[PDB]
């Protein structure tokens, strides 16, 4: 049993017709102090998987090292390490999900909420969630923390069920993700303007976008707002 | 206090109440009468927290006696029980509630019927053929459920009451030092001096 | 509960879902959460349902008397000041969280007020367990100089976000539109997107299925003549 | 919350962020924390929003009634009324209030009233959760008798840093300027102050 | 819950109710509270359902191993003690068990041991365990004789559970009856309390307080 | 400890075609101990019926209170109180004890004598009105009642069909609750006749 | 303090027919007032004509199902590919559950299938492994809403034959698979109306001598 | 368990132990023998936590019987009491201590003397002319302090024991269902079947 | 405690106050919080003095044994050893350590290891109770590739403000300069830095 110290906020993600998108801001909060401003919370594994992590950053860095070691280990005595016997998103998730549940079962959890986004060998989209309790679930849209409350409603308006996925392009999906990140910046006190976004597409592969910013913000209406009731 | 039983038979109400008064480690008394006569044909037994039991019982007694003098008339058992319930229902939301459970055994001279009312410290009133408070019902009700008849004589009621007390004396961990038994009927209230 | 308020060109609109719950159980599937403080001052309540109803009616009552006393139509700032001072006095023990909206001779107004007595001004607001879902929609689609039709659309969409995504919210969308120089129009069950499908089976019993011990006529009439 | 008031040559300026949080949720991102209790006596509020609003409303009432009887109150008088409410009700209040005002006789004055209900007259004052991060900056950069433009820059830069580090602070930077010329409201948006 | 077992001339009568509750919620009315350890031994379920089920099944395995090794039926004394020694090892850990281990052997005759999760092991003639135990004791104590017939003894056990089922909110559903002889136990059926109550009320004239 | 589940019991009310039904179990208990099988929870003031579940002392107290108030109402108004008005009176009365409430779950049922419209309403322990068109439930088996009513109920049932529906809703809900049962009563209410039926049920 | 348990809501229902058995469950997964997934399968085909659901805390539910599926695999390895009978599976699950007696799987487990006589079988478990063969069992959030309805409509409780007035019970006539599915659908539709954690979808696994079949139905999404 | 008394007279030790076994609400048994024979001339009575009492007593019994067989010799009462004390003194600092209080009544055949040892669950041993555990001493010691003589006969010891039990039955709140009395002397251990 | 490490053109400089408190009592006013774990790898310690000393001693041991086998360790390697101890024993430790070092290949590097045992490579780092007050100042005044004299001034001014506002910080300002030229110790007394 511990308590999270340095923490990352929402990770948001969704499926679209040819793959998955995942995004997370670059902040490492220390309580209400916005301590670290250059934290990468999306960690790619190979060219087919991106693992997005929220919650305790020290545990995130540990998980990052486990994934790095997983790639090394898979390559051992494996002539097809960059082909048929490469790591799949499903292998990476199941491994993490095993670790998470084992750790909670020893009453010593990795204080994280994790979303594994990727594309399988057969082109299938992979998107699944796991957290500190070892709880797992899949959905056309997935989000952690505040994103669950604010991003999901918006992302579900684009892909409300399974049959909406083939109708959703990468442009529409990315647009929805970017808007959600803006909404989270408006409303989550532990968010930052800077974020990373990763697209895993079955045709164009892994596109990793760094140093993105929330833009097109509405603040002008604030000038007219005066007092809290009767003040003019 | 501990065991208080009541049984309404054909023509009377019988109240049985334990004689023991225990203050923690020692049994201070083995002849305590846990009852008050509220009017010539109405008897109330009681059990609960020390001090509050007698204070409440005597307070009720005074009030009923006051009513009796003012109107030159004995209130019906039903009327007395309703007065008592209200006092307890008032008491439960007070600063310090009366922790007192009562049985009211009365003979209604107008209707020529015995009546037994069970009221707990919350002001929960029920009219019953037989009743108890605390753990007394847990041991005795299975016997009363089996043997009880509404046309029982006073003597048969006493015999069924003996069986209940015997079961209590067998299976209860506490020694309640027997019971004082009182009968309420058309002629008033009397105590069975050998039980 | 999901509740929103949205300012527009010539007035303000307020909306709410229609689910009231006891823990995880739905007590009422078509609850009315839009309350009238005065003809053109309406509010929606989240939190303790009877605290929201009681505080509305009390201030509504006093607002009516005040209106009669001053020979003037009630103002939203008056309802606001009376609500907040009442709620503050009770230090949050009256669990009323309200969005108050209306029109008066001064203009159109939109306020929020929380159980402890703090108030806030805004062009768009949301309250309740589905407020985050609603606010996501409001933050995505709100703009300055909305028309009446746009504001009703935005408000109801925000409630829908709560209905679908918040387990505390559900069933229908109620709306009330308060426009300057017009009667406030209360639109009960403005949307109905959650009608139950027909059941697979009728559960009407054959007569005489239930075992009966005794029958008797209950005298509901008063004591009769003659 | 990040709030401050700074006296300068021509009077005083109050500054504040606009973020109001319930835990990590931003309940209001465009809050007005600069409140008017009299024509040229304003205050910055921190702590319980219910408490500081209730206090401010009572003070406004007291100063209105004071004005009707005795004419315009001094800034000191306003601070004293704030203090009386905060001190006497310290057990039931969570309020940190900065009072700023402009007299013609006294010019710009700033009084800070922290949690306990004590009063402190200062050349400038900072308060709220975000103030902790700018004690160093403000102490190094404050000068007496600054110009209006310098004081606006000082407050803008200070609250910029408070907002940058404090998660409880954010949104727009509001400012109210109190001088002989009158009362001027200023607003500065994120795109402006984040690049400073 | 209400479970009882008593020794008499013809062996042992075991009678139990069938109700399981989680708070006020009635989870089941069809719970088997007599555990058939083997064809000669019975155990009763009270306290923890899993603890009773698991460990009295396990007890059956130990009894079977005993008779394989010793070529002789295990005594009720030995069987009950295997169980009490086991739960005593777990004392403090939070096992919940109140059971009657019932058997009829040559050397002992009809024998009942009350075994309990705090390590108690008591031999006796009449035992009653559960939330409705006090109600069942009343009927048992006032009607029990050693020279009861098998028929009357079976009824007495049935009637005693009914008394509990009526008054105790957490007892009811149905009554299960068993008769333990030297040659093994004999099951005497499942009896719905709802139907049994009215039947007993009419035939016996009891429960005059209840309108039927 | 939890005051609303010491004594146990349930009430259910339903609307039908030109009729309403209200029903309750008869149990009063002290937790596990059954104490009375004749504790009726439905009362009436003129043609307005009130069921009350929860803490039994409050059930009794509120019945006496509403008898009191409806008697004064009648003397002053020179007419019997209506279900809609009485509902507001119950709500008002409960909320006046906002911070020391009666631990009850009242249910109003009746037909407006002037409009002929069937009416039912439910309340939480401080007066929040639930005015459902279909059915109202209350008590320690309210979950079970919700489940029964939701599946068994259909609108515009004739009085004698409504009797079967509400009876089966109560009985089967009560049989899945330890603290409810020991008898049951069903009132079938029409504009100028009310029938009261005691049901036969299991006594455990 | 770290709480190793959670509540993922959900409601499951097992009904044993004469020569069939159904195990149904809603597909909604939740925490508090949020929806995690509108379609997260909860009832699983475990091989050997056995279906299983472990409702409650989904991490323990998934772990248990996984370990039971594994137990089936090793039963085949160790006992010459012998079919695991439903009664043997039930006893095996008791040991899986009781193995964590002092740190339980926070789940209410139900399995369904056919017994060795080809008759429909449903077994119901508590979190620590106490189990029973049952005819009818709802589990999870809306179990209290569903069971009384099933008592009335499957077992005809409190129903008597018209004209006799309580003297003759309604006879317990056997229900078809179509009849059971109707009652399952109406149970979940009603539960969806009155319980906030029930909704989105209903997935039913039907077990017969021919094997395991699936049926899916939409539920309200509010 | 509840009352266990011991008295060492001229030529014997007498142990009196209550017969009641109460599990919370009900008295499950009224004929329980709270004693074990450790050797032909050594008897141990016991009281304390449920389960632990019998487990400890039988464990001690087994050990003494093992010693008796190995050496073909009966340990003196003093030796047995010292063994028992060490087991309890070891137990008190264990993970889960035996909550058991004992009286050891033995006749030393070498010294031709009766001996009574009182040991509590902490391993506090004292040799006494008369002893008790729990609240038993509070009621009985004033009577024993008055009447006791070291040259009492067994019959006089039993009469003084009766007076002690009578006082217990009068002033104790709990019904302990009488006592089983056993005498330990040169001829061994025997039970007084009428008391 | 107020501690910081700042990279600059020629390497890195560590800075610290010298106050160690037990409650409000100053148990040591001349503490040396700049600790050597290798020739040109030092650290600043904050949190439990027992914990940070124990950790530092173990690290020093590890790097000594590393050096004997594999030659001079990198600053990254030293940070990793610190992190391993802090992360794996997070339940039983209260340690906030800044690691600073000079390689010839990598030049000046700074790693901060906060309470949880995470690692963060930064151009400069601040920590300890006094650091809260100088987030604004340090963020506004830090530049990359400063001179030695500029970095000394930056640290001196920063820790001056941290000391001014934090009661837990005080005494002398110690500094250790790590460059290719070697290791230089600096000390600055109250009369110097208080007048800044
Ligand atoms: Mg911020
Ligand atoms: Mg019962
Ligand atoms: Mg029941
Ligand atoms: Mg639902």
Swiss-Prot record, chain A:
Keywords: Cytoplasm, Nucleus, Proteasome. Gene3D superfamilies: Glutamine Phosphoribosylpyrophosphate, subunit 1, domain 1 (3.60.20.10). It comes from the Eukaryota. GO terms for biological process: proteasomal ubiquitin-independent protein catabolic process; proteasome assembly; proteasome-mediated ubiquitin-dependent protein catabolic process. The keyword Heme does not apply. Pfam families: Proteasome. It is found in: Cytoplasm; Nucleus. PANTHER family: METALLOPROTEASE TLDD, PROTEASOME SUBUNIT BETA. Present with 16900 molecules/cell in log phase SD medium. Belongs to the peptidase T1B family. The 26S proteasome consists of a 20S proteasome core and two 19S regulatory subunits. The 20S proteasome core is composed of 28 subunits that are arranged in four stacked rings, resulting in a barrel-shaped structure. The two end rings are each formed by seven alpha subunits, and the two central rings are each formed by seven beta subunits. The catalytic chamber with the active sites is on the inside of the barrel. Interacts with CIC1. This is Proteasome subunit beta type-7.
UniProtKB/Swiss-Prot annotation, chains B, H:
This is Proteasome subunit beta type-4. Belongs to the peptidase T1B family. One of its GO terms (cellular component) is nucleus. Non-catalytic component of the proteasome which degrades poly-ubiquitinated proteins in the cytoplasm and in the nucleus. It is essential for the regulated turnover of proteins and for the removal of misfolded proteins. The proteasome is a multicatalytic proteinase complex that is characterized by its ability to cleave peptides with Arg, Phe, Tyr, Leu, and Glu adjacent to the leaving group at neutral or slightly basic pH. It has an ATP-dependent proteolytic activity. This subunit has a chymotrypsin-like activity. SUPFAM superfamilies: N-terminal nucleophile aminohydrolases (Ntn hydrolases) (SSF56235). CDD domains: proteasome_beta_type_2. It comes from Saccharomyces cerevisiae (strain ATCC 204508 / S288c) (Baker's yeast). It is found in: Cytoplasm; Nucleus. The keyword Cytoplasm applies. The keyword Phosphoprotein applies. PANTHER family: METALLOPROTEASE TLDD, PROTEASOME SUBUNIT BETA TYPE-1. Keywords: Acetylation, Cytoplasm, Nucleus, Phosphoprotein, Proteasome. InterPro entries: Ntn_hydrolases_N, Proteasome_beta2, Proteasome_bsu_CS, Proteasome_sua/b, Proteasome_suB-type. It comes from the Eukaryota. One of its GO terms (molecular function) is endopeptidase activator activity. The modification Phosphoserine is found at residue 76. Present with 21800 molecules/cell in log phase SD medium.
Swiss-Prot record, chain F:
This is Proteasome subunit beta type-3. It comes from Saccharomyces cerevisiae (strain ATCC 204508 / S288c). Belongs to the peptidase T1B family. Its main location: cytoplasm. PANTHER family: METALLOPROTEASE TLDD (PTHR32194), PROTEASOME SUBUNIT BETA TYPE-3 (PTHR32194:SF10). GO terms for biological process: proteasomal ubiquitin-independent protein catabolic process; proteasome-mediated ubiquitin-dependent protein catabolic process. There is a cross-link at residue 69 (Glycyl lysine isopeptide (Lys-Gly) (interchain with G-Cter in ubiquitin)). The modification Phosphoserine is found at residue 30. GO terms for molecular function: endopeptidase activator activity. It is found in: Cytoplasm; Nucleus. Keywords: Cytoplasm, Isopeptide bond, Nucleus, Phosphoprotein, Proteasome, Ubl conjugation. InterPro entries: Ntn_hydrolases_N, Proteasome_beta_3, Proteasome_bsu_CS, Proteasome_sua/b, Proteasome_suB-type. Non-catalytic component of the proteasome which degrades poly-ubiquitinated proteins in the cytoplasm and in the nucleus. It is essential for the regulated turnover of proteins and for the removal of misfolded proteins. The proteasome is a multicatalytic proteinase complex that is characterized by its ability to cleave peptides with Arg, Phe, Tyr, Leu, and Glu adjacent to the leaving group at neutral or slightly basic pH. It has an ATP-dependent proteolytic activity. This subunit may participate in the trypsin-like activity of the enzyme complex. Transmembrane segments: none annotated. It comes from the Eukaryota. One of its GO terms (cellular component) is cytosol.
UniProtKB/Swiss-Prot annotation, chain G:
CDD domains: proteasome_beta_type_1 (cd03757). Keywords: Cytoplasm, Nucleus, Proteasome. One of its GO terms (cellular component) is nucleus. SUPFAM superfamilies: N-terminal nucleophile aminohydrolases (Ntn hydrolases). One of its GO terms (biological process) is proteasomal ubiquitin-independent protein catabolic process. The keyword Cytoplasm applies. The keyword Nucleus applies. It is found in: Cytoplasm; Nucleus. Belongs to the peptidase T1B family. Non-catalytic component of the proteasome which degrades poly-ubiquitinated proteins in the cytoplasm and in the nucleus. It is essential for the regulated turnover of proteins and for the removal of misfolded proteins. The proteasome is a multicatalytic proteinase complex that is characterized by its ability to cleave peptides with Arg, Phe, Tyr, Leu, and Glu adjacent to the leaving group at neutral or slightly basic pH. It has an ATP-dependent proteolytic activity. The 26S proteasome consists of a 20S proteasome core and two 19S regulatory subunits. The 20S proteasome core is composed of 28 subunits that are arranged in four stacked rings, resulting in a barrel-shaped structure. The two end rings are each formed by seven alpha subunits, and the two central rings are each formed by seven beta subunits. The catalytic chamber with the active sites is on the inside of the barrel. This is Proteasome subunit beta type-6. It comes from Saccharomyces cerevisiae (strain ATCC 204508 / S288c) (Baker's yeast).
């Amino acid at each position: 049993t511990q308590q999270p110290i340095v923490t990352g906020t929402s990770v948001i993600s969704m499926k679209y017709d040819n793959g998955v998108i995942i995004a997370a801001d670059n902040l490492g909060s220390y309580g209400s102090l916005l301590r670290f401003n250059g934290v990468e919370r999306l960690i790619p594994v190979g060219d087919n998987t991106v693992v997005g992590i929220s919650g305790d950053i020290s545990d995130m860095q540990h998980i990052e090292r486990l994934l790095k070691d997983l790639v090394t280990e898979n390559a051992y005595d494996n002539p097809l390490a960059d082909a048929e016997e490469a790591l799949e998103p499903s292998y990476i998730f199941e491994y993490l999900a095993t670790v998470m549940y084992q750790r909670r079962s020893k009453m010593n959890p990795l204080w994280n909420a994790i979303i594994v986004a990727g594309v399988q060998s057969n082109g299938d989209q992979f998107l699944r969630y796991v957290n500190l309790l070892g709880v797992t679930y899949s959905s056309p849209t997935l989000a952690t923390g505040f994103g669950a409350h604010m991003a999901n409603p918006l992302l579900r308006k684009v892909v409300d069920r399974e049959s909406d996925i083939p109708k959703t392009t990468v442009q529409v999906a990315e647009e929805a993700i970017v808007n959600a990140m803006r909404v989270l910046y408006y409303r989550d006190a532990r968010s930052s303007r800077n974020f990373s976004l990763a697209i895993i597409d079955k045709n164009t592969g892994l596109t990793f976008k760094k140093n993105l910013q929330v833009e097109n913000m509405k603040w002008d209406f604030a000038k007219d707002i005066k007092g809290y009731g009767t003040q003019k | 206090m501990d065991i208080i039983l009541g049984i309404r038979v054909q023509d009377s109400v019988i109240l049985a109440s334990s004689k023991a008064v225990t203050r923690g480690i020692s049994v201070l008394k083995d002849s305590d009468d846990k009852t008050r006569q509220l009017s010539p044909h109405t008897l109330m037994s009681f059990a609960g927290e020390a001090g509050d039991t007698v204070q409440f019982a005597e307070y009720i007694q005074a009030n009923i006696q006051l009513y009796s003098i003012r109107e030159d008339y004995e209130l019906s058992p039903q009327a007395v029980s309703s007065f008592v319930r209200q006092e307890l229902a008032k008491s439960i939301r007070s600063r310090r509630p009366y922790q007192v459970n009562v049985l009211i055994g009365g003979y209604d001279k107008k209707k020529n019927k015995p009546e037994l009312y069970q009221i707990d410290y919350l002001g929960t009133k029920v009219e019953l053929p037989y009743g108890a408070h605390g753990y007394s019902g847990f041991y005795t009700f299975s016997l009363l459920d089996h043997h009880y008849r509404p046309d029982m004589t006073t003597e048969e009621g006493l015999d069924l009451l003996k069986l209940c007390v015997q079961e209590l004396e067998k299976r209860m961990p506490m020694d309640f030092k027997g019971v004082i038994v009182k009968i309420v009927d058309k002629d008033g209230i009397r105590q069975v001096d050998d039980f | 509960t999901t509740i929103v308020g949205v300012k527009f060109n010539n007035g303000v609109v307020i909306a709410a879902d229609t689910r009231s719950t006891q823990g995880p159980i739905v007590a009422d599937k078509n609850c009315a959460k839009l309350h009238r403080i005065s003809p053109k001052i309406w509010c929606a309540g989240a939190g303790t349902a009877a605290d929201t109803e009681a505080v509305t009616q009390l201030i509504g009552s006093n607002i009516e008397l005040h209106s009669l006393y001053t020979s003037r139509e009630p103002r939203v700032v008056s309802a606001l000041q009376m609500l907040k001072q009442h709620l503050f006095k009770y230090q949050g023990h009256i669990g009323a969280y309200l969005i108050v909206a209306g029109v008066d001779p001064t203009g159109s107004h939109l306020f929020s007020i929380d159980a402890h007595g703090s108030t806030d001004v805004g062009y768009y607001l949301s309250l309740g367990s589905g407020s985050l879902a609603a606010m996501a929609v409001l933050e995505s689609h709100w703009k300055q100089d909305l028309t009446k039709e746009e504001a009703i659309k935005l408000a109801s969409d925000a409630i829908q976000a709560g209905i679908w995504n918040d387990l505390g919210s559900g069933s229908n969308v109620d709306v009330c539109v308060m426009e300057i120089g017009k009667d406030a129009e209360y639109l009960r069950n403005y949307l109905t997107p959650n009608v139950r499908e027909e059941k697979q089976k009728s559960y009407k019993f054959p007569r005489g299925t239930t075992a009966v011990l005794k029958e008797s006529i209950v005298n509901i009439c008063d004591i009769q003549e003659e | 919350t990040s709030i401050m008031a700074v006296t300068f040559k021509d009077g005083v300026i109050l500054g504040a962020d606009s973020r109001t949080t319930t835990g990590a949720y931003i309940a209001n991102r465009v809050t007005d924390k600069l409140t008017r209790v009299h024509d040229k006596i304003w205050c910055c509020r921190s702590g319980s929003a219910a408490d500081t609003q209730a206090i401010a409303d009572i003070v406004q009432y007291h100063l209105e009634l004071y004005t009707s009887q005795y004419g315009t109150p001094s800034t000191e008088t306003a601070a004293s009324v704030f203090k009386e409410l905060c001190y006497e009700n310290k057990d039931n209040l969570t309020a940190g209030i900065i009072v700023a005002g402009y007299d013609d006789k006294n010019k710009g004055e700033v009084y800070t009233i922290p949690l306990g209900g004590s009063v402190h007259k200062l050349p400038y004052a900072i308060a709220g959760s975000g103030s902790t991060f700018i004690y160093g900056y403000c102490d190094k950069n404050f000068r007496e008798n600054m110009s209006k433009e310098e004081t606006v820059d000082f407050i803008k830069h200070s609250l910029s840093q408070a907002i940058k580090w404090d998660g409880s602070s954010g949104g727009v930077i509001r400012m109210v300027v109190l001088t002989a010329a009158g009362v001027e409201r200023l607003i500065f948006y994120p795109d402006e102050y984040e690049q400073l | 819950t209400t479970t009882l077992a008593f020794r008499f001339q013809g062996g042992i009568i075991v009678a139990v109710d069938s109700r399981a509750t989680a708070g006020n919620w009635v989870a089941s009315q069809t719970v088997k509270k007599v555990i058939e350890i083997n064809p000669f031994l019975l155990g009763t379920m009270a306290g923890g359902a899993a603890d009773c089920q698991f460990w009295e099944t396990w007890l059956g395995s130990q009894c079977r191993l005993h008779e394989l090794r010793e070529k002789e039926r295990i005594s009720v004394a030995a069987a009950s003690k295997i169980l009490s020694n086991l739960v005593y090892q777990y004392k403090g850990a939070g096992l919940s068990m109140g059971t009657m281990i019932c058997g009829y052997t040559r050397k002992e005759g009809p024998t009942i041991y009350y075994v309990d999760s705090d390590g108690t092991r008591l031999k006796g003639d009449i035992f009653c365990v559960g939330s409705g135990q006090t109600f069942a004791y009343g009927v048992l104590d006032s009607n029990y004789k050693w020279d009861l017939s098998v028929e009357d003894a079976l009824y007495l056990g049935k009637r005693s559970i009914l008394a509990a089922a009526h008054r105790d909110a957490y007892s009811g559903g149905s009554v299960n009856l068993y008769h333990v002889t030297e040659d093994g136990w004999i099951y005497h059926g499942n009896h719905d309390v709802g139907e049994l109550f009215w039947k007993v009320k009419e035939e016996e004239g009891s429960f005059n307080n209840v309108i039927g | 400890s939890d005051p609303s589940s010491i004594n146990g019991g349930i009430v259910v009310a339903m609307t039908g075609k030109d009729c309403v039904a209200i029903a309750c179990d008869l149990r009063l208990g002290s937790q596990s101990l059954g104490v009375s099988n004749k504790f009726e929870k439905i009362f009436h003031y003129g043609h307005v019926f009130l069921g009350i579940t929860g803490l039994a002392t409050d059930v009794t107290t509120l019945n006496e209170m509403f008898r009191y108030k409806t008697n004064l109402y009648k003397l002053k108004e020179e007419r019997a109180i209506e279900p809609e008005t009485f509902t507001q009176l119950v709500s008002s009365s409960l909320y006046e004890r906002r911070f020391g409430p009666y631990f009850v779950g009242p249910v109003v049922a009746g037909i407006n004598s002037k409009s002929g419209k069937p009416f039912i309403a439910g309340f939480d322990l401080i007066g929040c009105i639930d005015e459902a068109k279909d059915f109202i439930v209350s008590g320690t088996a309210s979950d079970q009642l919700f489940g029964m009513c939701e599946s068994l109920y259909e609108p515009n049932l004739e009085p004698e069909d409504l009797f079967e529906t509400i009876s089966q809703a109560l009985l089967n809900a009560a049989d899945r609750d330890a603290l409810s049962g020991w008898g049951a009563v069903v009132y079938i209410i029409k504009k100028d006749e009310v029938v009261k039926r005691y049901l036969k049920m299991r006594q455990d | 303090q770290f709480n190793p348990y959670g509540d993922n809501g959900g409601t499951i229902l097992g009904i044993a027919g004469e020569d069939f058995a159904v195990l149904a469950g809603d597909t909604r997964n939740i925490t508090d007032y949020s929806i995690n997934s509108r379609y997260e399968p909860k009832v699983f085909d475990c091989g050997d004509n056995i279906v299983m659901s472990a409702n409650g805390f989904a991490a323990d539910g998934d772990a248990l199902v996984k370990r039971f599926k594994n137990s089936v695999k090793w039963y085949h390895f160790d006992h010459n590919d012998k079919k695991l009978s439903i009664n043997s599976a039930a006893r095996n699950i008791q040991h899986l559950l009781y193995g964590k007696r002092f740190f339980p799987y926070y789940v209410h487990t139900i399995i369904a299938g056919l017994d060795e006589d080809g008759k429909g079988a449903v077994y119901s478990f508590d979190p620590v492994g106490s189990y029973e063969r049952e005819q009818c069992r709802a589990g999870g959030a809306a179990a209290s809403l569903i069971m009384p309805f099933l008592d009335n409509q499957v077992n005809f409780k409190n129903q008597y034959e018209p004209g006799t007035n309580g003297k003759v019970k309604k006879p317990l006539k056997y229900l078809s698979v179509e009849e059971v599915i109707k009652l399952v659908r109406d149970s979940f539709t009603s539960a969806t109306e009155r319980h906030i954690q029930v909704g989105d979808g209903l997935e039913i696994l039907i077990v017969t001598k021919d094997g395991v079949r699936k049926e899916f139905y939409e539920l309200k999404r509010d």
